[PDB]
Amino acid sequence: DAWFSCASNQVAQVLLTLPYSFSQLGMMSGILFQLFYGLMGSWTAYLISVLYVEYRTRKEREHVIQWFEVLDGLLGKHWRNLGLIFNCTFLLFGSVIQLIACASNIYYINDKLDKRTWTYIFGACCATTVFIYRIWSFLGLAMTTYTSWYLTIASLLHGQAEDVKHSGPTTMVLYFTGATNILYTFGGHAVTVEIMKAIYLLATIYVLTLTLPSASAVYWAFGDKLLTHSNALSLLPKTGFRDTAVILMLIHQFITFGFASTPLYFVWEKLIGVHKRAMARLPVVVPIWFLAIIFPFFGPINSAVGSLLVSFTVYIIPALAHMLTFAPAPSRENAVERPPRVVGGWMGTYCINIFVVVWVFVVGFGFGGWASMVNFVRQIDTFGLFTKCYQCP
Incomplete structure (x- = not known):
């Protein structure tokens, strides 16, 4: 069940925007x-897993565990608050991106209504999730594998046009936007769901089979035209397989929205003390619906969220927590699970954590963050806020 989870937790969302980042970055x-x-995401997932195990063992020596609870148990209350805020904001923006993707996908099969009306309808539809897993874990694998291997097969059949030009990296802003989009793509394994290793690393290598051939085949066939089309289904010819992929993606995004709204709603209920109940969750829906309407961007929003929220939520915070919790000598002496010998032991783990923090801050947040924000403002200037249809001819 663990492998099924990580396969499509965060890969389906970014699968359609991957060729856009590939064109922005070059092959x-x-x-x-x-x-x-992918390697960094697997490492961060391992760090989170070991932290969870350490916290559980410490609690047992003297419900479902949550990341903020782990931080509270290990480091302190300040880290608890930091992790809670970051996780809540990341979930909110993930829901926003899910609604945006739902609207973008549903537009293509039925283009009678512009994208804005479609997001209106879909926001109204998912507002009912307030009134509302293991079995669906396998299903999500099946609906994302079809899309990943439909973009590859369909794109190759389409072939290269007589005038497609692969510009490659031309501006630093686009390059770093694509890099941050990839960073966001590989921030799904760090999701704390489905927590009781090299065996679990086989989940990320599988994710690399969905993302590599799909992004390379779509970008290769359509050249640099992907820059103006974040959604890869726009360029592909209309066919029954495209409609099947759109329907599967819509179902996946709707179910993921419904499932990932539960933790944010629980946190809101605890904060407000409500613990008839639909009214309490209404004010939480309002920010999500408004954000999707005002910023219907499909790829730029992914890049901005990956640069700002994910870079700290799933890359820097876990590394800092692992470095600080095991900093005392007694903590390492009584460690429940020693680091694997293949990664250099404690010295290698600390060096890897330092490198991860430095990288994700200098280029994962500074260069990447600046580039993503500049691109977001550029799209705001181009299509304007409250745009009727984002990238529609």
């Missing part, structure tokens, strides 16, 4: 960033 840089960020 070589895109592949290299994909591999590097």
Whole structure:
């Protein structure tokens, strides 16, 4: 069940926008960033797992565990608050992106209504999730594998046009936007759901089979035209398989929205003390619906969220927590699970954590963050806020 979870927790959302980042980065840089960020995501997932195990063992020596609870148990209350805020904001923006993707996908099969009306309808539809897993874990694997291997097969059949030009990396802003989009792509394994290793690393290598051939085949066939089309289904010819992929993606995004709204809603209920009940969750829906309408961007929003929220939520905070919790010598002496010998032991783990923090801050948040924000403002200037249809001819 663990493998099924990580397969489509956060890969389906970014699968359609991957060719956009590939075109922004070039083929070589895109592949290299994909591999590097897959490795980094697997490492951060391992760090989170070991932290969870350590916290559980410490609690047992003297419900469902949550990341903020782990931080509270290990480091302190300040880290608890930091992790709670970051996780809540990340979930809110993930829901926003899910609604945006739902509207963008549903537009293509039925283009009678502009994207704005579609997001209105979908926001109204998901407002009913307030009134509202293991079995669906397998299903999500099946609905994302079809899309990943439909973009590859369909794109190759389409072939290269007589005038497609692969510009490659032309501006630093676009390059770093694509890099941050990949970073966001590989921030799904760190999701704390489905927590009781090299065996679990086989989940990320599988995710690399969905993302590598799909992004390389779509970008290769359509050249640099992907820059103006964040959603890869716009360029592909209309066919029954495209409609099947759109329907599967819509179902996946709707179910993921419903499932990932539960923790944010629980946190809101605890904060407000409500613990008839639909009214309490209404004010939480309002920010999500408004954000999707005002910023219907499909790829730029992914890049901005990955740069600002994910970079700290799933990359820097886990590394800092692992470094600080095990900093005392007694903590390492009584460690429940020693680091694997293949990664250099304690010295290697600390060096890797330092490198991860430095990288995700200098280029994962500074260069990447600046580039993503500049691109977001550029799209705001181009299509304007409350745009009727984002990237629609």
